[PDB]
Amino acid sequence: TPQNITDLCAEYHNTQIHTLNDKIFSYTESLARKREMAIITFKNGATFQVEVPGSQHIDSQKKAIERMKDTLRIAYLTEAKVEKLCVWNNKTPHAIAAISMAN
Amino acid sequence: TPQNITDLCAEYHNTQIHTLNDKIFSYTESLARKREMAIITFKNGATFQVEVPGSQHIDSQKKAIERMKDTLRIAYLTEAKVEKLCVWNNKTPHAIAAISMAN
Amino acid sequence: TPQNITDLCAEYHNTQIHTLNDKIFSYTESLARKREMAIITFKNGATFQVEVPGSQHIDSQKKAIERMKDTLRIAYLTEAKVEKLCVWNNKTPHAIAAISMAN
Amino acid sequence: TPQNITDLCAEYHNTQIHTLNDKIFSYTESLARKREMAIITFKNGATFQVEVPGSQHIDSQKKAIERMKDTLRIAYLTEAKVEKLCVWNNKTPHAIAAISMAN
Amino acid sequence: TPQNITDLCAEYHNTQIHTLNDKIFSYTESLARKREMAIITFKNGATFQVEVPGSQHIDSQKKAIERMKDTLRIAYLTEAKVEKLCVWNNKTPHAIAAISMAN
Ligand SMILES: CC(=O)N[C@H]1[C@H](O[C@@H]2[C@H](O[C@]3(C(=O)O)C[C@H](O)[C@@H](NC(C)=O)[C@H]([C@H](O)[C@H](O)CO)O3)[C@@H](O)[C@H](O[C@H]3[C@H](O)[C@@H](O)[C@H](O)O[C@@H]3CO)O[C@@H]2CO)O[C@H](CO)[C@H](O)[C@@H]1O[C@@H]1O[C@H](CO)[C@H](O)[C@H](O)[C@H]1O
Ligand SMILES: CC(=O)N[C@H]1[C@H](O[C@@H]2[C@H](O[C@]3(C(=O)O)C[C@H](O)[C@@H](NC(C)=O)[C@H]([C@H](O)[C@H](O)CO)O3)[C@@H](O)[C@H](O[C@H]3[C@H](O)[C@@H](O)[C@H](O)O[C@@H]3CO)O[C@@H]2CO)O[C@H](CO)[C@H](O)[C@@H]1O[C@@H]1O[C@H](CO)[C@H](O)[C@H](O)[C@H]1O
Ligand SMILES: [Cl-]
Numbered sequence: 001t002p003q004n005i006t007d008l009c010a011e012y013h014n015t016q017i018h019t020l021n022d023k024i025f026s027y028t029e030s031l032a033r034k035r036e037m038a039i040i041t042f043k044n045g046a047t048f049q050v051e052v053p054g055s056q057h058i059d060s061q062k063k064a065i066e067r068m069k070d071t072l073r074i075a076y077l078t079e080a081k082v083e084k085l086c087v088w089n090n091k092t093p094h095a096i097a098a099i100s101m102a103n
Numbered sequence: 104t105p106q107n108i109t110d111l112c113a114e115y116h117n118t119q120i121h122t123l124n125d126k127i128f129s130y131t132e133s134l135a136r137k138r139e140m141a142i143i144t145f146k147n148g149a150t151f152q153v154e155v156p157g158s159q160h161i162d163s164q165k166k167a168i169e170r171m172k173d174t175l176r177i178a179y180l181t182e183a184k185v186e187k188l189c190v191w192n193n194k195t196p197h198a199i200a201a202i203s204m205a206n
Numbered sequence: 207t208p209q210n211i212t213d214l215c216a217e218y219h220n221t222q223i224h225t226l227n228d229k230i231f232s233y234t235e236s237l238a239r240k241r242e243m244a245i246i247t248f249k250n251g252a253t254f255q256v257e258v259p260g261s262q263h264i265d266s267q268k269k270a271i272e273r274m275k276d277t278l279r280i281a282y283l284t285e286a287k288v289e290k291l292c293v294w295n296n297k298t299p300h301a302i303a304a305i306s307m308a309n
Numbered sequence: 310t311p312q313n314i315t316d317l318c319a320e321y322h323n324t325q326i327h328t329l330n331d332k333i334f335s336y337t338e339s340l341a342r343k344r345e346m347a348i349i350t351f352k353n354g355a356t357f358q359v360e361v362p363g364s365q366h367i368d369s370q371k372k373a374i375e376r377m378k379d380t381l382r383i384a385y386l387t388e389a390k391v392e393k394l395c396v397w398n399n400k401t402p403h404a405i406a407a408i409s410m411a412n
Numbered sequence: 413t414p415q416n417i418t419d420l421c422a423e424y425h426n427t428q429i430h431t432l433n434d435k436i437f438s439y440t441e442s443l444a445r446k447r448e449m450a451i452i453t454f455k456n457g458a459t460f461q462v463e464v465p466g467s468q469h470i471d472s473q474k475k476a477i478e479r480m481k482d483t484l485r486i487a488y489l490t491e492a493k494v495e496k497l498c499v500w501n502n503k504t505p506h507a508i509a510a511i512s513m514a515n
Binding site: 001002003004005008011012057058060061063064065067068071074075078080083086096097098099100101102103 | 437438439440441442443444445446447448451453459461464465478481485488489491503504505
Binding site: 237242299 | 310311312313314317320321367369370372373374376377380383384387389392395405406407408409410411412
């Protein structure tokens with residue numbers, strides 16, 4: 001089993017690690033139909049998304065999706081420093097697959 | 104897929120962006136029959152609501168609505184500054200569709 | 207659709223507004239059978255309850271009962287000032303229908 | 310309907326009030342099979358548990374049990390002062406039936 | 413029945429206690445398929461995981477698994493001190509079974 005975000009990220013196709021070492025700059029949440037998702041940017045301008053759940057996700061992923069949204073929300077509110085992001089780069093904005101936070 | 108709230112709002116009918124750049128002034132919550140909802144106001148008098156889930160709403164929108172309510176409560180509690188709100192102006196108060204918070 | 211708590215409270219039978227403008231003094235919670243409920247009081251001795259969900263309530267009522275409880279707990283914990291409460295006066299202690307918070 | 314924890318506790322068999330007026334000393338949580346439970350202690354050594362959900366518990370019970378766990382966790386983390394506990398004294402450690410918190 | 417994490421940990425095969433008395437150093441969360449899990453680290457390098465639900469778990473443990481993730485998440489964000497962890501040492505990284513926190 002992967003021991004860290006890096007090795008975990010390397011297990012899938014079209015992924016890439018982004019090292020931020022910075023807190024989240026803005027948080028956006030949408031309840032609009034077909035656009036039920038969350039978006040975040042950082043000071044440098046990088047923008048990321050938590051994908052609207054769809055056909056490319058199995059049941060275990062749907063719940064993990066809801067948890068990831070809870071997570072970003074509280075991290076943003078408490079101004080926590082996000083270290084790294086493992087994202088799928090074949091989408092725009094890049095879709096978040098994993099996150100790590102280190103004080 | 105939109106990169107921001109403005110473009111996202113631009114994807115629906117009867118929507119509209121509101122720049123507040125201010126923390127929520129009042130938060131109201133009701134559990135009364137058929138009026139299970141939340142209402143927020145800003146110091147300028149601006150008043151918005153999170154629509155009572157309805158027949159039209161599907162499961163995805165339903166839990167999105169639940170999350171928004173959670174979002175408004177904690178944001179109000181943390182005095183988090185809200186930047187913009189994308190609302191459906193064909194209702195009174197205007198219903199919230201999306202929200203953005205900055206730093 | 208109503209825009210504030212006083213106007214909302216006025217749409218039902220046997221309700222009333224209690225103006226508090228003060229934080230909750232104590233929070234009580236129970237998991238005992240038939241009394242799975244929460245109770246709060248204010249320094250002035252005022253006491254209120256969130257009804258135990260019954261047969262009368264539909265699931266949308268039920269979910270709202272759940273949220274109110276969450277709301278009260280976190281309100282108590284953050285020491286937020288509660289402004290007004292819309293309550294059913296046909297019960298004892300008076301049962302909560304809606305709540306508003308503002309500073 | 311009871312208005313305080315003492316009166317509510319008095320409605321059952323084999324219960325008892327414990328007055329603590331102190332914050333939680335430690336919090337323990339387990340996911341191990343048949344031990345999916347929470348245990349809390351106070352500085353004076355006192356120890357209490359939230360029973361593992363079982364067959365006797367109706368939806369309202371199990372759900373109330375899940376809530377009690379969220380409550381104790383957050384009470385612990387925020388260092389909230391626990392006033393009294395209503396517990397079943399025919400179980401070791403004594404099992405929590407209700408809780409009250411005051412400043 | 414068991415009063416502490418040590419005794420509880422003792423009821424299973426392949427377990428072991430780790431006394432840490434320190435705060436979580438990094439927190440990692442993933443929503444990738446078959447990797448819907450969490451991983452934590454402590455300053456000395458020690459790594460632990462919450463296992464992806466599997467056939468070795470029942471619905472009761474599945475709930476508890478979601479709860480443990482929420483727990484690790486707030487503990488981290490709040491820099492709470494974890495005292496001990498009961499883990500399964502037949503896996504890599506070590507799988508968390510129970511956790512104790514004390515100021
Ligand atoms: C790259 C891709 O299209 N992935 C989609 C996936 O397709 C399957 C194979 O991809 C992997 C992968 O993503 O790397 C292979 C991994 O080892 C799998 N790992 C595990 C632990 O299961 C994952 C995993 O199944 C998915 O990520 C879960 O959603 O899938 C893909 O390579 C394969 O297609 C080959 C084909 O076999 C070969 O003959 C041909 O020559 O080349 C193809 C491309 O390499 O086909 C597999 C399906 O039959 O399928 C899932 C849905 O079932 C998704 O569509 C996944 O796409 C990504 O989904 C992400 C969410 O999980 C996210 O939205 C990304 O943005 C999507 O591209
Ligand atoms: C050690 C093990 O194999 N555990 C798996 C379990 O197997 C059962 C027996 O082990 C216990 C244990 O873990 O100590 C026995 C406990 O008394 C049980 N306690 C309670 C309250 O129920 C637990 C419990 O069932 C599991 O932890 C739940 O997942 O299981 C194991 O000894 C046994 O096989 C014996 C056999 O009976 C004996 O004749 C033979 O000669 O020696 C064998 C090995 O000592 O069989 C039991 C199952 O038939 O079964 C469950 C599935 O039901 C899991 O697969 C469990 O594996 C662990 O699961 C953990 C998560 O809960 C975690 O992932 C660990 O990493 C897994 O190893
Ligand atoms: Cl009884």
